[PDB]
Design an enzyme around this catalytic site. Structure first.
Site, PDB file in Angstrom:
ATOM      1  CD  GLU A  99     107.511 -50.512 -38.201  1.00  0.00           C
ATOM      2  OE1 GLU A  99     107.985 -48.747 -37.473  1.00  0.00           O
ATOM      3  OE2 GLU A  99     108.380 -50.815 -38.522  1.00  0.00           O
ATOM      4  CB  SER A 125      84.569 -30.937 -49.802  1.00  0.00           C
ATOM      5  OG  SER A 125      85.132 -32.721 -50.306  1.00  0.00           O
ATOM      6  CG  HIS A 164      80.213 -37.050 -57.014  1.00  0.00           C
ATOM      7  ND1 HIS A 164      81.149 -36.595 -57.203  1.00  0.00           N
ATOM      8  CD2 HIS A 164      79.324 -36.935 -58.036  1.00  0.00           C
ATOM      9  CE1 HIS A 164      80.866 -35.653 -58.642  1.00  0.00           C
ATOM     10  NE2 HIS A 164      79.806 -36.071 -59.234  1.00  0.00           N
ATOM     11  CE  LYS A 194      95.036 -24.355 -51.132  1.00  0.00           C
ATOM     12  NZ  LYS A 194      93.615 -24.431 -50.383  1.00  0.00           N
ATOM     13  CG  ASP A 195      95.046 -30.876 -55.086  1.00  0.00           C
ATOM     14  OD1 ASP A 195      94.658 -31.070 -53.743  1.00  0.00           O
ATOM     15  OD2 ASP A 195      93.727 -31.482 -55.338  1.00  0.00           O
TER      16      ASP A 195
HETATM   17  C1  HEM Z   1      93.215 -44.202 -49.572  1.00  0.00           C
HETATM   18  C2  HEM Z   1      92.297 -43.531 -48.410  1.00  0.00           C
HETATM   19  C3  HEM Z   1      91.492 -42.569 -48.870  1.00  0.00           C
HETATM   20  C4  HEM Z   1      91.591 -41.591 -49.753  1.00  0.00           C
HETATM   21  C5  HEM Z   1      92.294 -41.564 -50.814  1.00  0.00           C
HETATM   22  C6  HEM Z   1      90.581 -40.913 -49.428  1.00  0.00           C
HETATM   23  C7  HEM Z   1      90.132 -39.711 -50.121  1.00  0.00           C
HETATM   24  C8  HEM Z   1      89.075 -38.979 -49.576  1.00  0.00           C
HETATM   25  C9  HEM Z   1      89.364 -38.039 -50.921  1.00  0.00           C
HETATM   26  C10 HEM Z   1      89.349 -37.023 -52.076  1.00  0.00           C
HETATM   27  C11 HEM Z   1      88.132 -37.360 -49.850  1.00  0.00           C
HETATM   28  C12 HEM Z   1      87.409 -35.366 -50.562  1.00  0.00           C
HETATM   29  C13 HEM Z   1      88.542 -34.573 -50.196  1.00  0.00           C
HETATM   30  C14 HEM Z   1      88.679 -33.806 -48.914  1.00  0.00           C
HETATM   31  O1  HEM Z   1      88.607 -34.324 -47.834  1.00  0.00           O
HETATM   32  O2  HEM Z   1      89.523 -33.841 -48.340  1.00  0.00           O
HETATM   33  C15 HEM Z   1      87.481 -37.429 -48.762  1.00  0.00           C
HETATM   34  C16 HEM Z   1      86.375 -37.355 -47.869  1.00  0.00           C
HETATM   35  C17 HEM Z   1      87.014 -37.993 -46.207  1.00  0.00           C
HETATM   36  N1  HEM Z   1      87.543 -38.909 -46.388  1.00  0.00           N
HETATM   37 FE1  HEM Z   1      88.858 -39.980 -47.085  1.00  0.00          FE
HETATM   38  N2  HEM Z   1      89.710 -41.209 -47.785  1.00  0.00           N
HETATM   39  C18 HEM Z   1      90.869 -42.227 -47.916  1.00  0.00           C
HETATM   40  C19 HEM Z   1      89.993 -43.021 -46.374  1.00  0.00           C
HETATM   41  C20 HEM Z   1      89.550 -42.144 -45.792  1.00  0.00           C
HETATM   42  C21 HEM Z   1      89.979 -42.968 -44.017  1.00  0.00           C
HETATM   43  C22 HEM Z   1      91.079 -43.834 -43.527  1.00  0.00           C
HETATM   44  C23 HEM Z   1      88.506 -41.860 -43.821  1.00  0.00           C
HETATM   45  C24 HEM Z   1      88.192 -42.214 -41.908  1.00  0.00           C
HETATM   46  C25 HEM Z   1      88.436 -43.004 -40.963  1.00  0.00           C
HETATM   47  C26 HEM Z   1      88.100 -41.025 -44.368  1.00  0.00           C
HETATM   48  C27 HEM Z   1      87.374 -40.381 -44.074  1.00  0.00           C
HETATM   49  C28 HEM Z   1      87.386 -39.520 -45.172  1.00  0.00           C
HETATM   50  C29 HEM Z   1      86.092 -38.355 -44.378  1.00  0.00           C
HETATM   51  C30 HEM Z   1      85.368 -37.916 -42.998  1.00  0.00           C
HETATM   52  C31 HEM Z   1      86.150 -37.658 -45.365  1.00  0.00           C
HETATM   53  C32 HEM Z   1      84.862 -35.856 -45.641  1.00  0.00           C
HETATM   54  C33 HEM Z   1      86.143 -34.791 -45.319  1.00  0.00           C
HETATM   55  C34 HEM Z   1      85.223 -33.467 -45.638  1.00  0.00           C
HETATM   56  O3  HEM Z   1      84.371 -33.485 -47.084  1.00  0.00           O
HETATM   57  O4  HEM Z   1      85.506 -32.550 -45.072  1.00  0.00           O
HETATM   58  N3  HEM Z   1      88.851 -41.070 -45.799  1.00  0.00           N
HETATM   59  N4  HEM Z   1      88.661 -38.832 -48.985  1.00  0.00           N
HETATM   60  C1  LIG Z   2      86.904 -34.922 -54.062  1.00  0.00           C
HETATM   61  O1  LIG Z   2      87.449 -33.845 -54.438  1.00  0.00           O
HETATM   62  C2  LIG Z   2      88.234 -35.081 -54.717  1.00  0.00           C
HETATM   63  C3  LIG Z   2      88.217 -35.658 -56.024  1.00  0.00           C
HETATM   64  O2  LIG Z   2      86.951 -36.618 -56.582  1.00  0.00           O
HETATM   65  C4  LIG Z   2      89.158 -36.316 -56.302  1.00  0.00           C
HETATM   66  C5  LIG Z   2      88.436 -37.752 -57.686  1.00  0.00           C
HETATM   67  C6  LIG Z   2      90.804 -36.479 -56.460  1.00  0.00           C
HETATM   68  C7  LIG Z   2      91.440 -37.333 -56.832  1.00  0.00           C
HETATM   69  C8  LIG Z   2      91.771 -38.601 -56.030  1.00  0.00           C
HETATM   70  C9  LIG Z   2      91.550 -40.069 -56.606  1.00  0.00           C
HETATM   71  C10 LIG Z   2      90.512 -40.493 -57.727  1.00  0.00           C
HETATM   72  C11 LIG Z   2      92.657 -40.878 -55.987  1.00  0.00           C
HETATM   73  C12 LIG Z   2      91.793 -42.534 -56.890  1.00  0.00           C
HETATM   74  C13 LIG Z   2      92.847 -43.602 -56.501  1.00  0.00           C
HETATM   75  C14 LIG Z   2      92.844 -44.732 -56.975  1.00  0.00           C
HETATM   76  C15 LIG Z   2      91.467 -45.184 -57.301  1.00  0.00           C
HETATM   77  C16 LIG Z   2      94.089 -45.677 -56.973  1.00  0.00           C
HETATM   78  C17 LIG Z   2      94.930 -46.691 -57.803  1.00  0.00           C
HETATM   79  C18 LIG Z   2      94.795 -47.747 -58.131  1.00  0.00           C
HETATM   80  C19 LIG Z   2      95.159 -48.421 -59.077  1.00  0.00           C
HETATM   81  C20 LIG Z   2      95.894 -47.920 -60.564  1.00  0.00           C
HETATM   82  C21 LIG Z   2      94.928 -49.877 -59.496  1.00  0.00           C
HETATM   83  C22 LIG Z   2      96.321 -50.616 -60.262  1.00  0.00           C
HETATM   84  C23 LIG Z   2      96.940 -50.211 -61.875  1.00  0.00           C
HETATM   85  C24 LIG Z   2      97.798 -50.524 -62.296  1.00  0.00           C
HETATM   86  C25 LIG Z   2      98.432 -48.902 -61.469  1.00  0.00           C
HETATM   87  C26 LIG Z   2      98.486 -51.068 -62.840  1.00  0.00           C
HETATM   88  C27 LIG Z   2      99.898 -50.394 -63.472  1.00  0.00           C
HETATM   89  C28 LIG Z   2     100.787 -51.448 -64.444  1.00  0.00           C
HETATM   90  C29 LIG Z   2     101.780 -51.908 -64.181  1.00  0.00           C
HETATM   91  C30 LIG Z   2     102.966 -51.080 -62.970  1.00  0.00           C
HETATM   92  C31 LIG Z   2     102.727 -52.708 -65.129  1.00  0.00           C
HETATM   93  C32 LIG Z   2     103.771 -51.947 -66.475  1.00  0.00           C
HETATM   94  C33 LIG Z   2     104.041 -53.482 -66.887  1.00  0.00           C
HETATM   95  C34 LIG Z   2     104.905 -53.660 -67.700  1.00  0.00           C
HETATM   96  C35 LIG Z   2     104.878 -54.735 -69.433  1.00  0.00           C
HETATM   97  C36 LIG Z   2     105.786 -52.936 -68.341  1.00  0.00           C
HETATM   98  C37 LIG Z   2      90.587 -36.026 -55.480  1.00  0.00           C
HETATM   99  O3  LIG Z   2      92.003 -35.498 -55.672  1.00  0.00           O
HETATM  100  C38 LIG Z   2      89.535 -34.667 -54.691  1.00  0.00           C
HETATM  101  O4  LIG Z   2      90.089 -33.872 -54.301  1.00  0.00           O
HETATM  102  C39 LIG Z   2      91.285 -32.338 -54.593  1.00  0.00           C
HETATM  103  C1  LIG Z   3      95.977 -39.466 -58.532  1.00  0.00           C
HETATM  104  C2  LIG Z   3      97.925 -38.326 -58.356  1.00  0.00           C
HETATM  105  C3  LIG Z   3      97.418 -37.035 -57.994  1.00  0.00           C
HETATM  106  C4  LIG Z   3      96.718 -36.567 -57.457  1.00  0.00           C
HETATM  107  C5  LIG Z   3      96.149 -35.345 -57.786  1.00  0.00           C
HETATM  108  C6  LIG Z   3      96.832 -33.850 -57.885  1.00  0.00           C
HETATM  109  C7  LIG Z   3      96.477 -33.451 -58.929  1.00  0.00           C
HETATM  110  C8  LIG Z   3      97.958 -32.983 -59.657  1.00  0.00           C
HETATM  111  C9  LIG Z   3      98.137 -33.752 -61.328  1.00  0.00           C
HETATM  112  C10 LIG Z   3      99.256 -32.738 -62.032  1.00  0.00           C
HETATM  113  C11 LIG Z   3      98.125 -32.097 -63.563  1.00  0.00           C
HETATM  114  C12 LIG Z   3      98.578 -30.266 -63.600  1.00  0.00           C
HETATM  115  C13 LIG Z   3      98.768 -29.968 -64.942  1.00  0.00           C
HETATM  116  C14 LIG Z   3      97.416 -29.586 -65.568  1.00  0.00           C
HETATM  117  C15 LIG Z   3      97.117 -29.440 -67.148  1.00  0.00           C
HETATM  118  O1  LIG Z   3      97.338 -30.186 -67.846  1.00  0.00           O
HETATM  119  O2  LIG Z   3      97.510 -28.230 -67.106  1.00  0.00           O
HETATM  120  C16 LIG Z   3      97.213 -27.545 -68.501  1.00  0.00           C
HETATM  121  C17 LIG Z   3      98.371 -27.559 -69.191  1.00  0.00           C
HETATM  122  O3  LIG Z   3      98.968 -26.871 -68.293  1.00  0.00           O
HETATM  123  C18 LIG Z   3     100.801 -26.300 -67.567  1.00  0.00           C
HETATM  124  O4  LIG Z   3     100.833 -25.552 -68.356  1.00  0.00           O
HETATM  125  C19 LIG Z   3     100.768 -27.938 -67.671  1.00  0.00           C
HETATM  126  C20 LIG Z   3     101.596 -27.990 -66.332  1.00  0.00           C
HETATM  127  C21 LIG Z   3     102.749 -29.206 -66.075  1.00  0.00           C
HETATM  128  C22 LIG Z   3     102.885 -29.456 -64.436  1.00  0.00           C
HETATM  129  C23 LIG Z   3     102.206 -30.718 -64.615  1.00  0.00           C
HETATM  130  C24 LIG Z   3     103.540 -31.676 -63.462  1.00  0.00           C
HETATM  131  C25 LIG Z   3     102.774 -32.907 -63.643  1.00  0.00           C
HETATM  132  C26 LIG Z   3     103.387 -33.296 -61.909  1.00  0.00           C
HETATM  133  C27 LIG Z   3     102.647 -35.237 -61.472  1.00  0.00           C
HETATM  134  C28 LIG Z   3     101.770 -35.126 -60.631  1.00  0.00           C
HETATM  135  C29 LIG Z   3     101.095 -36.726 -60.470  1.00  0.00           C
HETATM  136  C30 LIG Z   3     101.756 -37.204 -60.878  1.00  0.00           C
HETATM  137  C31 LIG Z   3      95.897 -26.560 -68.933  1.00  0.00           C
HETATM  138  O5  LIG Z   3      96.472 -25.767 -68.770  1.00  0.00           O
HETATM  139  P1  LIG Z   3      95.302 -24.544 -68.338  1.00  0.00           P
HETATM  140  O6  LIG Z   3      95.317 -23.876 -66.780  1.00  0.00           O
HETATM  141  O7  LIG Z   3      95.560 -24.105 -69.419  1.00  0.00           O
HETATM  142  O8  LIG Z   3      94.014 -25.280 -68.715  1.00  0.00           O
END
Ligand code: HEM
Ligand SMILES: COc1c(O)c(C)c(C/C=C(\C)CC/C=C(\C)CC/C=C(\C)CC/C=C(\C)CC/C=C(\C)CCC=C(C)C)c(O)c1OC
Ligand SMILES: CCCCCCCCCCCCCCC(=O)O[C@H](COC(=O)CCCCCCCCCCCC)COP(=O)(O)O
Ligand SMILES: CCCCCCCCCCCCCCCCCC(=O)OC[C@H](COP(=O)([O-])OCC(O)COP(=O)([O-])OC[C@@H](COC(=O)CCCCCCCCCCCCCCCCC)OC(=O)CCCCCCCCCCCCCCCCC)OC(=O)CCCCCCCCCCCCCCCCC
Ligand SMILES: CCCCCCCCCCCCCCCCCC(=O)OC[C@H](COP(=O)([O-])OCC(O)COP(=O)([O-])OC[C@@H](COC(=O)CCCCCCCCCCCCCCCCC)OC(=O)CCCCCCCCCCCCCCCCC)OC(=O)CCCCCCCCCCCCCCCCC
Ligand SMILES: CCCCCCCCCCCCCCCCCC(=O)OC[C@H](COP(=O)(O)OCCN)OC(=O)CCCCCCCCCCCCC
Ligand code: HEC
Ligand code: HEM
Ligand code: HEM
Ligand SMILES: COc1c(O)c(C)c(C/C=C(\C)CC/C=C(\C)CC/C=C(/C)CC/C=C(\C)CC/C=C(\C)CCC=C(C)C)c(O)c1OC
Ligand SMILES: COc1c(O)c(C)c(C/C=C(\C)CC/C=C(\C)CC/C=C(/C)CC/C=C(\C)CC/C=C(\C)CCC=C(C)C)c(O)c1OC
Ligand SMILES: CCCCCCCCCCCCCCCCCC(=O)O[C@H](COC(=O)CCCCCC)COP(=O)(O)OCCN
Ligand code: FES
Lengths: 53, 92, 383, 245, 125, 143, 165, 92, 51
Positions: free
Chosen positions: C272, C206, C202, C228-229
């Protein structure tokens, strides 16, 4: 118009989203289930048990 | 709040790029235009363009490691064949 | 101001996923990050609901996974969605780690974002390896013995660490029961490192495929890269649905369905498909201590890559030879994982040495010298 | 020679994305298990209730599980006593402990086949080609150790499992001819059911999920393009400002 | 990371040597159009990374006109790239318009920053 | 569909659903004996009864018992008495065939229980619960 | 007020976390503390009987109950740790209060070397009283009936909760 | 960065209090003064001062609920005593 | 090893009463060490008058 009745209010727009999704749950489930059994006629359990007569 | 460091991005209003002037933009609402307008003539002519540009960057690099693995696989097949045990004992 | 920006909790959501300014020309290779966030939630959620039916004892570890598959309502959906999502997790991550190396994403000012990724890369290998021994299959017992007995090469200290890690003299009840409790912990550490990973993303944002400044043309994250995602989310959940409902056991190995036996070894102990290539780097060196140093270096060699690249252009897009040798290195790794599938026999050993040499030399000789002439061809070709 | 001969792909009726098991073949395969391979192999992970509504009727399964005996909770003074089986119990194997299995079969340990289909590479093709892949004599050049039979498909060649499949060793309840090829096609079907009793429901829930997701995937492309339509056709012009300022 | 003055002293020597400027310059010119940045309307110096204090200094000394035009070629390339197409053939960069407009500013900024680091470590006799 | 699959997994599995019904024999239960069976993780006080205590159950007035119910409603075939073991006050185990009315006597708080399962002397709020059971020939499936 | 409401959410999750970890031991008091508390939702009309059967994973407290109580007990502390992060985020916008109840923006001192070393005074006193209850009287606060294995047939003499509930 | 809300605290430099003027502070380094200088005459005279102020705020509120619990405990002891069952039956 | 194989055989020898396992009796009966000692020596020769 058709717009004035359905798409104007977001209260009734999402209502018919849920109402149409309520019907689709049961209609689609029965439509897929029947073709699946029809494509596999003569193999399912109810056909072998029916053969014992 | 506490002061922060120096970065290479700002936010809406002070994004941090150069000052621009003399560049104009036009756009049209998507409610007024037809999407999917040119999907054909893009799935045929546009894709062929891009393919013809970047395909010797992937083929020759894949054309070297396919003949290298095959002449080792068909060589390992002779070394462990009934006709190639005599060469096996000189490399084992 | 608006409530989404005034509230303490909603302002963090606003500045990360709603009002975040994105480059207007990033292609589909930048969708890979959100797919890993989707897959992290899938592993955790499908793991908490599946941890309600699993016993970590060496007596009940294998038998309980069958009870999940035969007795739990939709219990087979839980275990195929969790066993195949682990394999899909690595394929998206390699395409995230390879897009970064192609467009030169590791270069400054994003080196910390690059190093945090390598830490995330290791913890996921351990998390997948730890969860692999939880099943206590025949392949998991001997995959545990070989990997854990690897630290017996550190002099004068290895024999105590190995006995400390096993909790005893071999892989037995004390090993599996502590492997599972660790496997539940590490994903919460990865989730915390991802938070630190997005914090370093942040500050600068990107990158874009052109490799130039992106501060001139930005569009908001919402309604453009949220929808688009959604295109790749539905395509990822469709290919995953094909591997879960139509061919669940294609990626795995059939020997994991045998209960682990300490007396009889399998015909071929193979890892694997995602750890397969590094298995060849380990086995190329004809020594025990030197194998560990060579095996782990291949992960650590990525760390010097911001220093070896001597180019004044980010990426491989406008470079003919730097784009040329990249695909050989890509393929050499694809070839590197091919020998590890084959036995240790003539002439796969000779292939195993030259191939791993060209692997290491790309970072240390080719990338620095081709990047050097490329600066000169660029200079006299314009002058 | 030591990898074992590759077995070809046969025409199984349940291959393909929409085919279910032939539940008449599961009913017949269970009959040739009970009388042929019940003596030396186990099926420890199959409860009795799973057979109701798949291969046999409820009164048929409540009688098959009553021919066996299970150990009951102790009586009023702690003495042990036996009880007849019910629908909640599992299929009993032929041997009490692992030592008694190796005694009857010359030291070889016969595996549990509740997971054999997903545990031997070669899937359904390897079990079928195993029991019918026995030559009348070993190939010229090889002298087998005593007590072991030759079979090329087995990796390494030499195996300890004999021939058990002949002609007309079993009579069916629906008049099917009892040939060596016929039964070997049936047990592999019954054993695949044991390893995957969720087979049919998985393939029909998949059709529902693929059709729903494939049209969701297409609908998302239209919505992506509709919302991206204002940026795809956006047009820029450049007119250099005067250098007076 | 290999500086720019370092790779320019390599250049002016090859240019002046008749044997070298005949052997490799006729091979370098095909490397530029094969790279293909000209077709999106990009001058070479717009490709160099600018996230370091050396390039940020030269980008400030750049005149207004060459900074306004530089803003437009980058915007045009960003817009053209997202459409998965190229510019029309009659707007591409020719051979003569691709001039080193960012060269002298990079060079005058490194020799004044080389002097600083060579004066911070003077060992006076 | 997704939420339903995850929540459904939490619901009872096939083997637990299977242990739901227990049958008991119509001859093995003796006259002066109290079967205390753990059915569905709950105690059940079975007692095959005598034909003399049926008038003894409805002998007392409805003022001596705060939940009015006779013997014939609390047990259908009067040759048995199948009672839920969880007492209405706390859930204690009354002592078997010891007390003052031929039935049970809770030693925790002195609630007397008759041969029909009602309270007689005690501060317990209700008569003791009767589970679901149905005769099918030589057996009766409680639950 | 938000800092006050987040505290109440934290207050509830800790009661559940302590209650869930209490049934993990599967003592005689924990079995019947589980039955009484979980059978409390049978008072919600027309829906209670299904929720109770859904929460138990069956018809009573048996193997499906304890095995899912432990996996939940490992999860909730990671939710409390996440709510504490949100708890300190609402504490940072306005800061702590003072016993006088008036503005505190006139006289401030840094957290380090003043309230880092004053917190060290109570840390050592907390770890000293805790050391007395751990080495010299470990079972004073608990109940002796928890050392009996849980029995579904016989109830304790008095089902009592821990001193904080 | 994005704009934030309005709070009731600042940071070092803009803490958000009123403007102050005419107030002076003196301090001495702790390396130059003796701590523990007045621990006695504070453990005796100072503690007694504070106690005498806030002790009827805690005692009478504790003096009401101690006599209320005792007259119920010594009443419950008679109601379940051999001499107090006749009063028990009229309250049971 | 204990004296009885199953819980049913313990209740048969001791008139139906289940004799507990004393590996934890000290921390499981209120009265600590004082309750076990006063138990085995606290038996009167006859029950008190009235019972
Ligand atoms: C659960 C694992 C990971 C998540 C959720 C994650 C998520 C992200 C996200 C959301 C971005 C910004 C969007 C993008 O560039 O596509 C990003 C950028 C990046 N991540 Fe990760 N990442 C993960 C693991 C890793 C790993 C394992 C590496 C390297 C070994 C890595 C290296 C990078 C790099 C270099 C960028 C910058 C890409 C750019 O700005 O062009 N990330 N990551
Ligand atoms: C730079 O551009 C970005 C960007 O900035 C971000 C933020 C995202 C979005 C990505 C993320 C924020 C990923 C974040 C991922 C995590 C932090 C993982 C989430 C982990 C958790 C939620 C922790 C685990 C906890 C739970 C889910 C508990 C759930 C509860 C349960 C199962 C209990 C249920 C039981 C009962 C009693 C009903 C992008 O996709 C992206 O590019 C488009
Ligand atoms: C971390 C895990 C997910 C990664 C992020 C990818 C982003 C996708 C999230 C989906 C949200 C899109 C709807 C946005 C919205 O509220 O638009 C609202 C209303 O849009 C709609 O009509 C909603 C369409 C319903 C599709 C939602 C299906 C969800 C599928 C599951 C995805 C996650 C498991 C705002 O619309 P606006 O464009 O007028 O502002
Ligand atoms: C034959 C190829 C035909 C396509 C073509 O034009 O050929 C040249 C074309 C290259 O065109 P380019 O403009 O030179 O470079 C593409 C850019 O990267 C620009 O990338 P993009 O925006 O075109 O997207 C690249 C890719 C994006 O594809 C992905 O990133 C795959 C996403 C998968 C999500 C789920 C993954 C699950 C785990 C793995 C299974 O999608 C496509 O290629 C769509 C083409 C229609 O080839 C491809 O891109 C083939 C990609 C195949 C996948
Ligand atoms: C008889 C009491 C003698 C003390 C006295 O002056 O009486 C009045 C004095 C009240 O004086 P004040 O100036 O009117 O009000 C005290 C202020 O709250 C101002 O509080 P503070 O700064 O004096 O600290 C209150 C308390 C602070 O005590 C705590 O917060 C206890 C910390 C325990 C940490 C470990 C806890 C572990 C879990 C529980 C076990 O510590 C003391 O009272 C130290 C007195 C020397 O009584 C007490 O404060 C007695 C506190 C006893 C604890
Ligand atoms: C694996 C993906 C690694 C990163 C992407 C990559 O290497 O793509 C390179 C190439 C096309 O990428 P370009 O940046 O050249 O596309 C714009 C051209 N004007 O992509 C290709 O040539 C196709 C690669 C398909 C895999
Ligand atoms: C005569 C005893 C006997 C009968 C009957 C029998 N088997 Fe076997 N089987 C064995 C023995 C012994 C082995 C172990 C041999 C070893 O692995 O070398 C074995 C091994 C196997 C294996 C393991 C092969 C592998 O590659 O490890 C499979 C599969 C198998 N049997 C399937 C079957 C099937 C299917 C049937 C009938 C439907 C059957 N067996 C009937 C004795 C028998
Ligand atoms: C990124 C996170 C995770 C990854 C990559 C991961 C990966 C794996 C893998 C590969 C297996 C073996 C699958 C198989 O072949 O059968 C596994 C098993 C298991 N995992 Fe995870 N896991 C993750 C998180 C979790 C979490 C958070 C939990 C529990 C809360 C969990 C619980 C389990 C259980 C119980 C098993 C054994 C059950 C079984 O597979 O049959 N996992 N995990
Ligand atoms: C693990 C649990 C908790 C932790 C670690 C925690 C931590 C903190 C910390 C560090 C402060 C600032 C310092 C202080 O005021 O003493 C604070 C303030 C506060 N907490 Fe908590 N807290 C927790 C639970 C709770 C609970 C359960 C409540 C209410 C039910 C609560 C209500 C408050 C309030 C009102 C304040 C403000 C006090 C003030 O500023 O004067 N907290 N908390
Ligand atoms: C497959 O090879 C292995 C491996 O065998 C092990 C044991 C670990 C380490 C795993 C553990 C046993 C637990 C240690 C993991 C942590 C990151 C510590 C976190 C908590 C403190 C690995 O990281 C690893 O990959 C390189
Ligand atoms: C002692 O009384 C109880 C109680 O019996 C239960 C079950 C819960 C709830 C506990 C669970 C069984 C798990 C649900 C807990 C969550 C906070 C959900 C988190 C994950 C989704 C309580 O919060 C609680 O205290 C009021
Ligand atoms: C971390 C991300 C969390 C996202 C979800 C929480 C959004 C909460 C929005 C409502 C809100 O802030 O209302 C709060 C009150 O919230 C509570 O009482 C408890 C909130 C707990 C939330 C637990 C998830 C009121 O906010 P307030 O009116 O003070 O506005 C401040 C800025 N004007
Ligand atoms: S349990 Fe029935 S009265 Fe105490």
């Amino acid at each position: 118009s058709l717009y004035k009745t359905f798409f104007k209010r977001n209260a009734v727009f999402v209502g018919t989203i849920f109402a149409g999704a309520f019907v689709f749950q049961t209609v689609f489930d029965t439509a897929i289930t029947s073709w699946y059994e029809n494509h596999n006629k003569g193999k399912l359990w109810k056909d072998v048990k029916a053969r014992i007569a | 709040g506490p002061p922060s460091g120096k970065t290479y991005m700002g936010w809406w209003g002070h994004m941090g790029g150069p000052k621009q002037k003399g560049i104009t933009s036009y756009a049209v609402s998507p409610y007024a235009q037809k999407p999917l307008q040119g999907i054909f003539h893009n799935a045929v002519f546009n894709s062929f363009r891009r393919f013809k540009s970047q395909f010797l960057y992937v083929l020759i690099p894949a054309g070297i490691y396919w003949y290298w693995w095959k002449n080792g696989n068909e060589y390992n097949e002779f070394l462990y064949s009934k006709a190639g045990r005599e060469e096996l004992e000189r490399v084992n | 101001m608006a409530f989404r920006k005034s509230n303490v909790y909603l302002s963090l959501v606003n500045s990360y996923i709603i009002d975040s300014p994105q480059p207007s020309s990033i292609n589909y290779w930048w969708n890979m990050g959100s797919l890993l966030g989707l897959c992290l939630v899938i592993q955790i959620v499908t793991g908490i609901f599946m941890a309600m039916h699993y016993s970590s004892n060496i007596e009940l570890a294998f038998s309980s996974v069958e009870h999940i598959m035969r007795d739990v309502h939709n219990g087979y959906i839980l275990r195929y969605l969790h066993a195949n999502g682990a394999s899909f997790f690595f394929m998206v991550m390699f395409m995230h780690m390879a897009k970064g190396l192609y467009y030169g994403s590791y270069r400054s000012p994003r080196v910390t974002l690059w190093n945090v990724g390598v830490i995330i890369f290791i913890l996921t290998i351990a998390t997948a390896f730890l969860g692999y021994c939880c099943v206590y299959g025949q392949m998991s017992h001997w995959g545990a013995t070989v990997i854990t007995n690897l630290f017996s090469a550190i002099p004068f200290v290895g024999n105590d660490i190995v006995s400390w890690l096993w909790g005893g003299f071999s892989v037995s009840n004390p090993t599996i029961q502590r492997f599972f409790a660790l496997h539940y912990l590490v994903p919460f550490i990865i989730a915390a490192m991802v938070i630190m990973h997005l914090m370093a993303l942040h500050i600068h944002g990107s990158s874009n495929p052109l490799g130039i400044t992106g501060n001139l043309d930005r569009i908001p994250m919402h309604s453009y890269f949220i929808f688009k995602d959604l295109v790749t989310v539905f395509l990822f959940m469709l290919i995953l649905a094909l591997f879960v409902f139509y061919s669940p056991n294609t990626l795995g190995h059939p020997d994991n369905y045998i209960p682990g036996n300490p007396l009889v070894t399998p015909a071929s102990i193979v890892p694997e498909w995602y750890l397969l290539p590094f298995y060849a780097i380990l086995r190329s060196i004809p020594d025990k201590l030197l194998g560990v140093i060579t095996m782990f270096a291949a992960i650590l060699v990525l760390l010097v890559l911001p220093f070896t690249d001597r180019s004044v252009v980010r990426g491989n897009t406008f470079k003919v030879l730097s784009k040329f040798f990249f695909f050989i290195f890509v393929f050499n790794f694809v070839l590197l994982g091919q020998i590890g599938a084959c036995h240790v026999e003539v002439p796969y050993v000779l292939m195993g040495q030259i191939a791993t040499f060209i692997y290491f030399a790309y970072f240390l000789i080719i990338v620095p010298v081709i990047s050097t002439i490329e600066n000169v061809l660029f200079y006299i070709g314009r002058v | 020679a030591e990898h074992g001969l590759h077995a070809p792909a046969y025409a199984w009726s349940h291959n393909g994305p929409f085919e279910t098991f032939d539940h008449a073949s599961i009913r017949r395969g269970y009959q040739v298990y009970r009388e042929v391979c019940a003596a030396c192999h186990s099926l420890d992970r199959v409860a009795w209730r799973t057979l109701v509504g798949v291969s046999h009727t409820n009164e048929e399964v409540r009688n098959m599980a009553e021919e066996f005996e299970y150990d009951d909770e102790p009586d009023e003074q702690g003495n042990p006593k036996k009880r007849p089986g019910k629908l909640s119990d599992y299929i009993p194997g032929p041997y009490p402990n692992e030592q008694a299995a190796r005694a009857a079969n010359q030291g070889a340990l016969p595996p549990d086949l509740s997971l054999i289909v997903k545990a031997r590479h070669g899937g359904c093709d390897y079990i079928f080609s195993l029991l019918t892949g026995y030559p009348d004599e070993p190939p010229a050049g090889v002298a087998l150790p005593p007590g072991s039979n030759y079979n090329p498909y087995f990796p390494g060649g030499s195996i300890a499992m004999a021939r058990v499949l002949f002609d007309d060793m079993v009579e069916y309840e629906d008049g099917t001819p009892a040939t060596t090829s016929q039964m070997a096609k049936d047990v592999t079907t019954f054993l695949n059911w044991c390893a995957e009793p969720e087979h049919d429901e998985r393939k029909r829930l998949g059709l529902k999920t693929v059709i729903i997701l494939s049209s969701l995937y297409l609908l998302s492309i239209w919505v992506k393009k509709f919302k991206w339509a204002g940026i795809k056709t956006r047009k820029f012009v450049f007119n250099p400002p005067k250098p007076r300022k | 990371p290999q500086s720019f003055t370092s790779i320019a002293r390599i250049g002016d020597y090859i240019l002046k040597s008749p044997v070298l400027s005949k052997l490799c310059v006729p091979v370098a010119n095909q490397f530029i159009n094969l790279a293909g940045y000209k077709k999106l309307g990009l001058k070479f110096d717009d490709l160099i990374a600018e996230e370091n204090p050396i390039m940020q200094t030269a980008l400030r000394r750049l005149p207004e006109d060459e900074s306004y035009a530089r803003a437009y070629r980058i915007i045009r390339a960003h817009q053209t790239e997202l459409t998965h197409h190229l510019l029309p053939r009659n707007e591409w960069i020719k051979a003569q318009e691709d001039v080193p407009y960012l060269l002298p500013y990079i060079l005058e900024a490194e020799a004044a920053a080389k002097e600083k680091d060579e004066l911070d470590n003077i060992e006076v006799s | 569909s997704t939420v339903e699959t995850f929540i459904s997994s939490m619901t009872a599995t096939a083997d637990v659903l299977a242990m739901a019904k227990v049958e008991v024999n119509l001859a093995a239960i003796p006259l002066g004996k109290n079967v205390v069976v753990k059915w569905q993780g709950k105690p059940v006080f079975i007692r095959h009864r005598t034909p003399h205590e049926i008038q003894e159950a409805n002998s007392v007035d409805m003022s001596a018992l705060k939940d009015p119910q006779t013997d014939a409603d609390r047990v259908k075939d009067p040759q048995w008495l199948i009672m839920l073991g969880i007492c209405t006050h706390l859930g204690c185990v009354p002592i078997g065939e010891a007390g003052d009315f031929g039935g049970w006597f809770c030693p925790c708080h002195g609630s007397h229980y008759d041969i029909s399962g009602r309270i007689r002397k005690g501060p317990a709020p209700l008569n003791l619960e009767i589970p679901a059971y149905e005769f099918d020939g030589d057996k009766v499936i409680v639950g």
